[PDB]
């Protein structure tokens, strides 16, 4: 069947079970949705932002928002480069991820979204006389990944055509969002669930799946290992249950993403040996990680925080590590090729440790 992440996905505002204040605020937003402003939900990845957006859409329109189909929209660049984008559509709303088009994301904003904003939605009234108009809802996934040009192109589209369109953007951090876009949106903070709420959800799933649990401490350990990511918590719960014949025990290992263990091994190697050859081996590991399309900034963050957890290191080493991490994160943001900056960070760490 479907993965437990999607199997037990809440489908309504009243079905939510953590961050009750956010649920109440969302319900207040849906009281009079006629004048609903553009929304920008920001929060840690995997906390349930898309789920809450879908719940709000369901409250405004109904369960039909969850009936989703996929279409392919074709775009042509100036150089005639033909490419395609996936548009997820429901009878009441549309879903797009322009960042999938990289530097061409702006085209998606200039051609597709604008057109959607320009075409007023009207329909014959079933009972009353005359047409009826309803604004279209559009969701922009990974808003923080948009290039500055696409964000600039969004401005007048949001303003002029507010009657026909209402945007709901979702992001993990607002730092890459340009100030004009933040000015045009209602900002909604989405806190991560606490360990207790994650454990409660996992225990509910366990009860539903008839999985024998030795003690509830296993769920707490899984929640701790997930670092507040409920999706990861559910995925590891399913993996552990399947690998243990649906009978979890305190001795059952906790499965973590493979790249995370790889980064931990890289950190251990960096701490142990510091030399040019060690740096070349670390570069090989970094290139292997990048081959799997892991973002460079995520790699840098994971490596930095893995290094900071090493007990043998002292305060000065950790301070130098965080300094270098900040500098090279800025370099990555302003750079073109990530390998230079990751290798430079590792070299600086090796110099400071030795």
């Amino acid at each position: 069947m479907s993965l437990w992440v999607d199997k037990y996905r809440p489908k309504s505002l009243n079905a939510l079970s953590h961050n009750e204040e956010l649920t109440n605020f969302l319900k207040s937003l849906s009281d009079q949705p006629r004048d609903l402003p553009h929304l920008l939900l920001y929060g840690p990845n995997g906390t349930g932002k898309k789920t809450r957006c879908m719940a709000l859409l369901e409250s405004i329109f109904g369960p039909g928002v969850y009936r989703l189909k996929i279409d392919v929209r074709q775009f042509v660049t100036a150089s005639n480069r033909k490419l395609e984008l996936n548009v997820v559509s429901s009878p009441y709303h549309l879903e797009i991820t322009p960042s999938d088009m990289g530097n061409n994301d702006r085209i998606v904003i200039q051609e597709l979204l604008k057109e959607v904003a320009q075409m007023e939605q009207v329909d014959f009234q079933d009972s009353k006389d005359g047409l009826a108009h309803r604004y279209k809802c559009v969701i922009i996934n990974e808003a923080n990944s948009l290039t500055k040009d696409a964000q600039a192109a969004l401005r007048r589209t949001m303003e002029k055509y507010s009657k026909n369109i209402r945007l709901i953007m979702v992001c993990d951090s607002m730092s890459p969002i340009i100030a004009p876009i933040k000015s045009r949106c209602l900002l909604i903070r989405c806190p991560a669930p606490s360990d207790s709420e994650i454990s409660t959800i996992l225990s509910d799933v366990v009860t539903n799946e008839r999985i024998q649990l030795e003690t509830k401490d296993i769920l707490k350990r899984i929640a701790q290992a997930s670092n507040g990511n409920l999706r990861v918590s559910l995925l590891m719960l399913e993996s552990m249950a399947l690998n243990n014949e649906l009978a979890l025990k305190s001795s059952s290992p906790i499965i973590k993403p493979d790249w995370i263990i790889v980064i931990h091994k890289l950190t251990r190697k960096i701490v142990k040996e510091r030399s040019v050859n060690s740096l070349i081996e670390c570069r090989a590991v970094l290139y292997d990680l990048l081959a799997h399309c892991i973002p460079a900034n995520i790699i840098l963050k994971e490596l930095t925080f893995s290094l900071l957890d090493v007990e043998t290191l002292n305060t000065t080493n950790k301070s130098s590590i965080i300094e270098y991490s900040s500098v090279f994160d800025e370099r990555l943001s302003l750079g073109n090729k990530a390998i230079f900056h990751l290798e430079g960070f590792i070299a600086k760490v090796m110099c400071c440790l030795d």
Binding site: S2, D6, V232, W259, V285
Partner: protein
Amino acid sequence: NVSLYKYNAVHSFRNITLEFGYYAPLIRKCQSYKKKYILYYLKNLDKFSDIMKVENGIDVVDRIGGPIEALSDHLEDQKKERDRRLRMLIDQYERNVMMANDDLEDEETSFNDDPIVDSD
């Protein structure tokens, strides 16, 4: 494509690179192994009804991008295989719409109380 057309689930590419690309294949591989074991036991002979729903040729059970070996026209062929599996997925969903729709709750019992009559 497989997820969208078999489980009505939409996931971002970023989440696939980070979480799903490793966890989902492992789960599907474990489910397939359990299904094979159960089938063998039955041949040699409801609780796990969600486990034998995995199709051998349609469900991905391998880590996306291969294993991360770090510290422990192929592209054309892969695209052709992806297009083929997408065609099969579209075929599986094409008939589902006409076959039945959720619509709303109605008096289904009364509908059966007035059955079609065909005779000359």
